[PDB]
Amino acid sequence: MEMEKEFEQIDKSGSWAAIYQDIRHEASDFPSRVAKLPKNKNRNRYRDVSPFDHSRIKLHQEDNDYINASLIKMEEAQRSYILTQGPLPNTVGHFWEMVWEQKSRGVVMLNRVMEKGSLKCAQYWPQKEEKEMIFEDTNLKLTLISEDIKSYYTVRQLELENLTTQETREILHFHYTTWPDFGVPESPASFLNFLFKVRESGSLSPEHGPVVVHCSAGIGRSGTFCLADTCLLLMDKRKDPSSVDIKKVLLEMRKFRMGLIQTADQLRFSYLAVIEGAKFIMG
Template sequence: MLTKLEEKQQECSFLYWSDLESRQFGEITIELIKKKEEIDYLHRQFKIAHLEQPEASYTLHHFQFLGWPERGVPVSALPLLQMIQNVQELYITLRTTEPITVMCSSGVGRTGVFIALGIVLERYSVEGMIDLFQTVKTLRIQRSAMVQTRLSQKKIVLSLKMTYSFFTLL
């Protein structure tokens, strides 16, 4: 989740969890198990259960990036890159084939940047190459407005430069 619940007095997302107690939606219960605060983002773990089959519950990992304003860019790319890395590491650790769901208020701006960065960084680690143009082009075939602005494109490039600089220092 790449948005706060509310920005500029406008609702961006529905609060479908509680940090204090479990919440019930029809026959589904969502209970917070764990919450970890990082710089500019939160990692929550929820237990999701059906009232009729509570033993068949499962764990949902929920990341929420808070340092990215609507129609803007994060002040620093580092927390965003750390969150992307944590999501990818968790995905590998859990050995899951389930899809990762990414959302912002519009579903294309911050979401597009997050997905593009994830793809480019993964491809770089496997193939040693970066093709940002082709990545964004492919994303836009699947969802037309992905990575909406030049500022968003610039943020991807700056994030990649930061990542490259970090890895060349190791």
């Protein structure tokens, strides 16, 4: 079926939970043996969210190459993304090592450091220009260059220096600051505006390594971001845009990381975002 009318048909019939449970039943199951090794317990935020062995990002290190991060490679859309958990106190150096080694330009953050009165990820970037951060375990230095605070999101320019080689690179930090503590946003308008700002920066384009996207677990909000981006790109590429099937795209992405889209409300919100976004691209 088309999307917008499949949408009203699920709303009127109140069957979002049944649709979402079908997706969960059909999703891929692949091994995650490296994630479950005992030496990696303090590298995982949640015991039930792990990268598959076949698609995990490897750190260029001979001691321990493990990070909780997955490469999502979308062949028809010609887009790639790295989805990862929010960094932990003992993985902030690994996180920036990955950004460096994978040649990423942008980092997309969809959570606040504290939500619901608890810590959802480490304070992994500097908050003042004159107070830079050094990650001694991976030999990197990170400096805040500029910051632009808007009503729904903040954009930061960061400088990452590899201290072994003295090479430097500019990294863009795109921080969506207004996702509610409970549920999903009422309108997708600010989320779509944010997606378009990431796109306009070059961070999603083939001349750079894959964008790094995270929330707390790296599967819920993060899944919504890449699902919406890929569906809108396919609608631009194909002769028949109504052939794009959001449930099929989501199942394809779940071949590369488990659990993408965590609730039926996130599924409905993804439909809403793609539907509204398709009108702005053109109508």
